[PDB]
Design a protein around this ligand. Structure first.
Ligand SMILES: *[C@@H]1O[C@H](CO)[C@@H](O)[C@H](O)[C@H]1NC(C)=O
Lengths: 49, 45
C-alpha cells in the first residue's frame, strides 16, 4: 500500500506543510500574546500598594 | 575436461563500504530538471 501511495507524495507533502504551518502559527500566537515585554520584572518583596 | 586449482592461500572474506553507488535508470523515459522519487531493488548506501 505504501508503494501504491508513493504517487500521492505531492498530496501528502501539501497536508504536512499545512499542518506545520498551523503549528508554527499557534506558537506565534502564544508568543505575540504573552511576550509583549522582554523584561521579566519581579514583584517587590513588600506589599504596600 | 577441466582442472581444479590446488595452490591456494585464502583469508577470511574482506569488507568495505559502498557509498552512494549502484543507482540506475528505472525507465526508458527522458526527464530533464526533475526531482523524481522511485522504489525498487537498490543497493543501500
Ligand atoms: C577437483 O578435482 C577433481 C576433478 O579433477 C574433482 O573430482 C574434485 O571434486 C575437485 N576437488 C575439490 C576439493 O573440490
Amino acid at each position: 500500500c505504501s508503494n501504491l501511495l508513493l504517487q500521492y507524495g505531492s498530496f501528502c507533502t501539501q497536508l504536512n506543510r499545512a499542518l506545520t504551518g498551523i503549528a508554527v502559527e499557534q506558537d506565534k500566537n502564544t508568543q505575540e500574546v504573552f511576550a509583549q515585554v522582554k523584561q521579566i520584572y519581579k514583584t517587590p518583596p513588600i506589599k504596600d500598594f | 575436461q577441466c582442472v581444479n586449482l590446488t595452490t591456494r592461500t585464502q583469508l577470511p572474506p574482506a569488507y568495505t563500504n559502498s557509498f552512494t553507488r549502484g543507482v540506475y535508470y528505472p525507465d526508458k523515459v527522458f526527464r530533464s530538471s526533475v526531482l523524481h522519487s522511485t522504489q525498487d531493488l537498490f543497493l543501500p548506501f
